[PDB]
């Protein structure tokens, strides 16, 4: 019983699908993160003292995470701070704390707590001045193992930097035209970052 402008309904659907594009992507990464962190061998080789031979040289948590999966940043963090860093597929001594506006200890605690329900955490971050999706899950062995103390559990962090091409492809996956970072056009703020995502206010859907 309520009619709407063609240009307006376009704008409303287009916001819904950009937001869905971010939520679906973020939620798939969460499950990816638990797949790598709820892993007995990971707990063995990264839970205390990280083995960069097993992780990077033997490619159990290595460059493929960037070259295939798109995680610009892969980290292992504990109470001391960043224990493993792989930035664009290459090993780094750079900390997560320097790479992000978010706090290492907040992400550590949030991830340790949701591991009790077998869940990961996620949020948006500023990563080297660009928008990014962050997921993290506690490094935990599987149920056959003895009960560990999650309070000292190390946490795995995957950072997905929303570069121009990835954003471009992301919009196409959801019927959005010219999804980009904002330097007439729709936009939304990425909460937790200084960045806004923008696109042309049109009818989302097929090319047709």
The stretch among 30-38, 131-139, 146-154, 190-198 that binds a second copy (CB under 8 A) is 30-38
Between residue 61 and residue 120, which ones bind a second copy under the rule CB under 8 A? Answer: 62, 64, 68-69, 118
CB 11, min distance to a second copy, A: 11
Instruction: Kindly state the smallest distance separating residue 121's Cβ from a second copy, in Å.
Output: 16
Tell how far CA 172 is from the center of its chain.
20
Which region, judged by CB under 8 A, interacts with a second copy, from 35-43, 94-102, 155-163, 194-202?
35-43
Contact 158, 65 (CB under 8 A): yes
Backbone gaps in the chain, preceding residues (C–N over 2.5 A): 183
Q: How far apart are CA 90 and CA 34, in angstroms?
A: 22
When binding is defined by CB under 8 A, the residue of 13, 92, 201, 202 that contacts a second copy is: 13
Q: Which stretch binds a second copy (CB under 8 A): 27-35, 43-51, 78-86, 182-190?
A: 27-35
Q: Comparing C-alpha atoms, which of 27, 158, 165 is closest to residue 89?
A: 158
Q: Does 7 bind a second copy (CB under 8 A)?
A: no
Q: Least Å distance between CB 63 and a second copy?
A: 9
CA distances from 23 to 50, 174, 208 (A): 31, 12, 26
What's the CA gap between 84 and 76, in Å, rounded? 5
In the sheet with 186-189, reading across from the earlier edge strand, the strands are 180-181, 196-199, 186-189
- What is the pattern of x (binds a second copy, CB under 8 A) and - over residues 130-169? ------------xxx-------------------------
Contact 39, 76 (CB under 8 A): no
The residue ranges that bind a second copy (CB under 8 A) are 9, 12-13, 15-17, 20, 23-24, 28, 31-32, 34-35, 38-41, 57-60, 62, 64, 68-69, 118, 142-144, 173-175, 203-206, 208
């Amino acid at each position: 019983s309520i009619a709407r402008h063609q240009d307006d309904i376009a704008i409303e659907q287009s916001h819904f699908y950009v937001e869905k594009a971010l939520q679906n992507r973020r939620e798939n990464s969460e499950q990816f993160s638990t797949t790598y962190s709820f892993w007995t061998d990971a707990y063995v080789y990264l839970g205390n003292r990280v083995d960069a031979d097993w992780a990077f040289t033997k490619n159990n948590l290595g460059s493929v995470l960037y070259t295939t999966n798109g995680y610009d940043g892969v980290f292992v963090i504990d109470d001391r701070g960043t224990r493993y860093a792989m930035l664009e597929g290459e090993l780094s001594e750079r900390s997560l704390a320097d790479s992000l506006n978010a706090d290492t200890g907040d992400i550590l605690r949030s991830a340790r707590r949701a591991a009790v329900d077998e869940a990961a955490i996620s949020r948006y971050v500023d990563f080297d001045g660009a928008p990014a999706i962050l997921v993290a899950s506690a490094i935990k062995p599987t149920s056959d193992h003895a009960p560990i103390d999650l309070a000292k559990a190390s946490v795995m962090v995957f950072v997905d930097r929303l570069t121009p091409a990835k954003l471009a492809k992301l919009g196409g996956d959801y019927g959005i035209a010219n999804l980009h970072l904002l330097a007439d056009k729709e936009s939304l703020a990425l909460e937790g970052t200084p960045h806004r995502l923008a696109w042309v206010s049109s009818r989302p859907g097929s090319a047709m």
